[PDB]
Amino acid sequence: HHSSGLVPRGSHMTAIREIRLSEPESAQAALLALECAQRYAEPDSADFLADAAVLAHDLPRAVRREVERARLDDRLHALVVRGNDVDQDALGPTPPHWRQARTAASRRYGFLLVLYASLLGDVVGWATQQDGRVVTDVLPIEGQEDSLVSSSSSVELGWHTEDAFSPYRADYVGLFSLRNPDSVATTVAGLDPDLVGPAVVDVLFGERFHIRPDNSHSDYFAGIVEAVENPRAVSILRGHRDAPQLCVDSDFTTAVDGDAEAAGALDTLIKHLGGALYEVVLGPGDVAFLDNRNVVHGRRPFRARFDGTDRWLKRINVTADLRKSRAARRDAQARVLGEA
Amino acid sequence: MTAIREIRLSEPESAQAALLALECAQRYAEPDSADFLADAAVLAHDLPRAVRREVERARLDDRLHALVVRGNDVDQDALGPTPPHWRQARTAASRRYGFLLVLYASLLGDVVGWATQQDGRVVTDVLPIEGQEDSLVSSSSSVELGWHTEDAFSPYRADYVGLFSLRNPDSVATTVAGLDPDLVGPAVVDVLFGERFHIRPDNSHLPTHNSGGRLSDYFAGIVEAVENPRAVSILRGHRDAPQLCVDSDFTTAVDGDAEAAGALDTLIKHLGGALYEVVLGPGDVAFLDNRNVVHGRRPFRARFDGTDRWLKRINVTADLRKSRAARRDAQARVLGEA
Ligand SMILES: NC(=[NH2+])NCCC[C@H](N)C(=O)O
Ligand SMILES: O=C(O)CCC(=O)C(=O)O
Ligand SMILES: O=C(O)CCC(=O)C(=O)O
Ligand SMILES: [Fe+3]
């Protein structure tokens, strides 16, 4: 049966907005995704993305009302929609690399992730990430167990705002779990300003920090080298004091040269977020949208077998304002940031 | 070729949009009631599919001038006389058109208003007012409404301006112009991309166009932007598809920047000449892409007898979250309450 509710974390009373699909809602969503897979080339082909926001209107009405409430909740951490259909037998094995993960059997889950995403905003990708795919793949890769990227397993994916260095960073990160037999978590933390010295909060609102791109990441790429070598002075907190946005990377953020007070405030924040991390586990057919304006996220160490049974998610970036990134996109309809 | 995207409603589509608007009017008090606006994005999904498809094509077209939806139902007899002032224009009979404007608008983004414009109403009224004939505000008639980016002065200016024509007996034209960078040349484009201009709030944000009971402090932000405008650009974004931000009556080059003053002078002559007409008849709704075009209104003679031209108007943002510093709370839609 259909249900939805608010799951608090610390003082964040709407931290998690949880929706449980009824069996009929799960079937309705699956039928729409399967129809899209019959009519359109790819989950991120131009033909589909031109239509995706209107096709998303055919998702179950009760679900659409709850997603719309989440979209306008400026204190949201994670929207979680549980109980989508995943046919494990038909899906087949977890591929051994994202380069082999855009499979025919998994297309219907990419389509469904884009349909849910398109209720929140417009889907985008990154030229430097998984060949500029909008629907990307999160799965463990043999030989990258001890890497700083989403294909890690043995070593914690360090928490960060997604693409923290970039003015074009996503408003939401979406994750559609295809399988997760060992219940491996995404880590999540937001700032509780009532747990931090107001003077530290004041410092974090100042343009007193450098956020550099991961090595992961032409006038755009001229800006990417300038971002490593001559990083702009940016704030970590921005907006209304009652609902500040957060932008920080635990591995790639420093205070401006000689700003010892900023260095102090940054390390106070890093210790606070480190201590406030909680977990969201997505079972097969569970989809999460993290509000990238409000939370950092990462992933816990886990034990990959590399036998075709490993954890596998589809991943997407969503922007509230596609138009604002036009300088960094190839043409009006292109969704790949840094393509031109 | 597709700068103006038009859909003419079939009789069934017109009836379906009217029925949805009347269902909203039965449920909610005001067309900008908080409970309605919370629900508006999902209620808008019940508009006719053919219309939602064309609105979505318009939304993703970064060279759009205006989406025009023709032939909505307007009952002229039931509507009654055109009010003599926007303050009196929140009429029972006109509620249904307010609701329908917000439903169309909510396909493109989230609706916002201004603390300092028509007393912070989200659904506003464009109608001629006796004594404002020669003014620079939307209630003018005799003096052409100068072309402008809506709320050009503000970083929170709308992405779309929605205009729902309730009546327009003399077919008075809305004016529209975009910028062709090729026609002004790379030299002037380079200058307009520079932060070398002052854009002041227009007169409708002044206490002279709001109720006298409105707090003085609502207006401190506007008066600061009139007195001490920031140095800003007129063009931004991709060179191949630049956004436009200029008000023909409230924009100047920064003192001493003769190059900038020349570029502005060139832009004004280019836009003033290319300025073209769109007539919104009763039941016609337009959404101007406020990132791409300036707009205005041709001069006309008002009769002031209750038969005059009357539009409902709305501001639409692609990104409500970005203005949270200027809004009272998460759901509040009135810019300048913080
Ligand atoms: N150049 C101008 N007249 N600018 C102001 C335009 C009218 C303004 N949008 C109003 O609501 O009154
Ligand atoms: O693997 C996860 O749970 C999270 C991965 C992710 O969101 C990311 O790649 O940034
Ligand atoms: O009256 C019109 O058609 C345009 C109105 C307008 O430009 C405005 O209200 O700012
Ligand atoms: Fe205007």
Side-chain angles (χ1 to χ4, degrees):
Chain A
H1 281 242
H2 179 89
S3 57
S4 64
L6 307 166
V7 178
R9 290 289 180 270
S11 97
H12 315 285
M13 292 299 101
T14 68
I16 299 162
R17 285 179 175 268
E18 201 169 58
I19 302 173
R20 161 69 56 190
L21 304 182
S22 73
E23 261 187 281
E25 290 173 335
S26 178
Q28 175 180 3
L31 180 58
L32 179 60
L34 287 163
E35 290 171 346
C36 291
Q38 291 177 158
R39 279 147 213 192
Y40 299 98
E42 306 303 340
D44 51 18
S45 60
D47 54 325
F48 178 56
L49 291 191
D51 285 351
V54 176
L55 290 166
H57 300 174
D58 293 318
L59 285 168
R61 191 187 193 86
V63 173
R64 285 187 286 121
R65 293 192 70 192
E66 290 152 351
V67 171
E68 175 64 13
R69 250 59 164 181
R71 193 181 65 86
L72 293 187
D73 181 356
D74 63 13
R75 294 288 77 189
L76 179 66
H77 289 194
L79 166 64
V80 185
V81 181
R82 302 204 190 260
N84 290 279
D85 178 52
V86 180
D87 183 342
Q88 292 296 335
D89 288 337
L91 181 58
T94 303
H97 199 284
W98 61 259
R99 285 186 178 110
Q100 300 171 60
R102 183 166 279 217
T103 72
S106 73
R107 256 157 18 89
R108 60 176 279 190
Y109 307 110
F111 279 103
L112 187 47
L113 175 54
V114 172
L115 289 166
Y116 281 121
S118 294
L119 299 172
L120 293 176
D122 294 307
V123 297
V124 290
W126 296 85
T128 62
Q129 294 168 192
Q130 302 192 15
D131 294 340
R133 289 172 172 170
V134 171
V135 179
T136 61
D137 290 273
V138 177
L139 44 73
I141 303 171
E142 203 165 23
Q144 296 179 30
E145 291 92 343
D146 176 11
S147 65
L148 310 170
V149 293
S150 66
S151 56
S152 66
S153 47
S154 304
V155 171
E156 183 130 3
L157 179 61
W159 54 262
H160 57 294
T161 305
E162 197 63 26
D163 307 305
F165 80 97
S166 178
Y168 307 128
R169 61 189 177 279
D171 297 304
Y172 302 95
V173 176
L175 298 166
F176 190 116
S177 181
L178 298 192
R179 68 169 55 109
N180 189 9
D182 306 314
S183 289
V184 173
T186 305
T187 63
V188 179
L191 167 68
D192 187 352
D194 292 350
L195 295 188
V196 181
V200 160
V201 169
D202 280 349
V203 172
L204 292 171
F205 270 93
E207 299 193 317
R208 297 172 64 172
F209 311 92
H210 296 316
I211 310 176
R212 288 172 164 89
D214 187 69
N215 298 5
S216 171
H217 300 265
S218 174
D219 274 331
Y220 176 88
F221 279 113
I224 296 302
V225 187
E226 270 282 297
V228 166
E229 290 183 15
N230 280 335
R232 188 161 293 282
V234 300
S235 62
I236 289 175
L237 300 180
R238 71 181 306 104
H240 195 116
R241 289 311 191 105
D242 293 349
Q245 302 186 13
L246 176 60
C247 187
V248 65
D249 184 318
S250 63
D251 290 306
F252 289 94
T253 309
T254 57
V256 160
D257 282 309
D259 199 339
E261 186 182 36
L266 172 55
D267 211 83
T268 294
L269 178 64
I270 289 175
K271 288 179 176 152
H272 168 74
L273 290 171
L277 279 172
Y278 63 88
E279 294 176 39
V280 173
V281 167
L282 300 174
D286 295 352
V287 55
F289 291 92
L290 307 175
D291 192 325
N292 195 52
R293 295 160 292 201
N294 293 338
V295 298
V296 298
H297 74 278
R299 202 224 53 251
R300 292 301 193 202
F302 74 99
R303 156 196 82 82
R305 295 143 287 213
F306 305 113
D307 65 350
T309 69
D310 283 313
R311 184 175 185 258
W312 183 14
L313 305 99
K314 301 287 178 180
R315 180 180 76 196
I316 200 154
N317 292 142
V318 191
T319 183
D321 193 349
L322 179 60
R323 190 65 56 82
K324 83 179 179 188
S325 65
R326 179 60 175 87
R329 296 184 290 100
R330 176 176 46 92
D331 55 70
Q333 302 314 318
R335 301 306 187 86
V336 183
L337 296 162
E339 201 186 6
Chain B
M1 58 260 133
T2 51
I4 300 285
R5 282 170 178 283
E6 174 180 290
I7 172 149
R8 181 158 285 282
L9 299 177
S10 73
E11 177 184 325
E13 293 166 338
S14 177
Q16 176 184 354
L19 196 72
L20 182 60
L22 288 165
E23 287 177 354
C24 294
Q26 194 158 244
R27 288 194 204 161
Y28 309 102
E30 301 287 341
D32 48 23
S33 286
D35 36 21
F36 172 51
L37 293 189
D39 292 331
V42 170
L43 286 169
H45 297 177
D46 298 320
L47 284 164
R49 193 186 190 83
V51 180
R52 291 188 282 119
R53 286 212 202 96
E54 193 58 33
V55 172
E56 183 62 13
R57 292 277 183 279
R59 193 181 66 81
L60 293 182
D61 183 354
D62 68 12
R63 295 291 74 189
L64 184 74
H65 287 196
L67 165 69
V68 186
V69 177
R70 305 279 189 185
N72 290 278
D73 175 49
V74 179
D75 182 341
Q76 291 297 333
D77 287 353
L79 182 56
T82 305
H85 201 284
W86 58 257
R87 198 205 203 154
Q88 303 177 45
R90 271 286 167 117
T91 66
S94 76
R95 284 167 67 247
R96 56 176 286 188
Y97 307 110
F99 281 106
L100 182 49
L101 175 54
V102 172
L103 289 166
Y104 281 121
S106 296
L107 297 175
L108 290 168
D110 297 305
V111 297
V112 290
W114 299 85
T116 52
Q117 197 177 66
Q118 295 194 18
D119 295 345
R121 286 171 183 181
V122 171
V123 177
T124 60
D125 290 88
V126 178
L127 38 72
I129 298 172
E130 209 161 341
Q132 307 292 341
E133 293 92 333
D134 307 332
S135 74
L136 307 185
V137 298
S138 66
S139 60
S140 72
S141 52
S142 306
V143 162
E144 175 160 16
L145 188 69
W147 54 256
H148 60 279
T149 308
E150 199 75 8
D151 305 310
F153 74 98
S154 178
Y156 304 127
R157 64 189 176 279
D159 295 305
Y160 303 94
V161 178
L163 296 168
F164 191 119
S165 181
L166 296 190
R167 62 169 60 119
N168 190 3
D170 299 317
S171 297
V172 174
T174 306
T175 61
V176 181
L179 179 56
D180 182 359
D182 297 333
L183 258 40
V184 83
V188 178
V189 168
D190 285 355
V191 173
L192 295 172
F193 259 93
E195 302 192 319
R196 299 161 71 167
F197 311 93
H198 289 329
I199 307 178
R200 293 186 156 78
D202 78 271
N203 294 336
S204 67
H205 286 278
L206 297 176
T208 50
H209 294 286
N210 290 269
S211 292
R214 297 285 293 174
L215 276 323
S216 189
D217 287 352
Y218 280 142
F219 299 99
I222 293 297
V223 174
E224 182 64 25
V226 171
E227 177 179 8
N228 295 316
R230 298 177 298 101
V232 299
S233 69
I234 286 169
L235 293 187
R236 68 187 311 104
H238 199 107
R239 278 299 198 286
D240 290 0
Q243 301 187 11
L244 179 62
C245 186
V246 54
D247 181 320
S248 65
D249 300 313
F250 294 95
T251 310
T252 59
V254 166
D255 280 357
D257 194 345
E259 242 212 319
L264 179 53
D265 209 290
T266 291
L267 181 58
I268 288 177
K269 259 167 88 268
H270 172 88
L271 292 180
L275 199 64
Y276 69 83
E277 292 189 6
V278 175
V279 172
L280 307 179
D284 298 348
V285 189
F287 290 94
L288 296 153
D289 195 321
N290 198 47
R291 299 162 289 199
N292 296 336
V293 300
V294 299
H295 74 276
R297 187 223 62 242
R298 292 293 300 154
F300 71 101
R301 199 163 312 161
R303 280 172 304 275
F304 298 122
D305 62 359
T307 66
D308 281 313
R309 187 174 187 265
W310 183 12
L311 327 171
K312 298 283 183 184
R313 179 185 58 189
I314 198 135
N315 287 114
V316 189
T317 184
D319 186 351
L320 183 61
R321 191 67 56 86
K322 86 184 180 180
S323 63
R324 183 55 174 92
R327 294 183 294 99
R328 186 185 70 238
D329 56 66
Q331 304 310 317
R333 305 302 189 90
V334 182
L335 296 162
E337 287 190 328

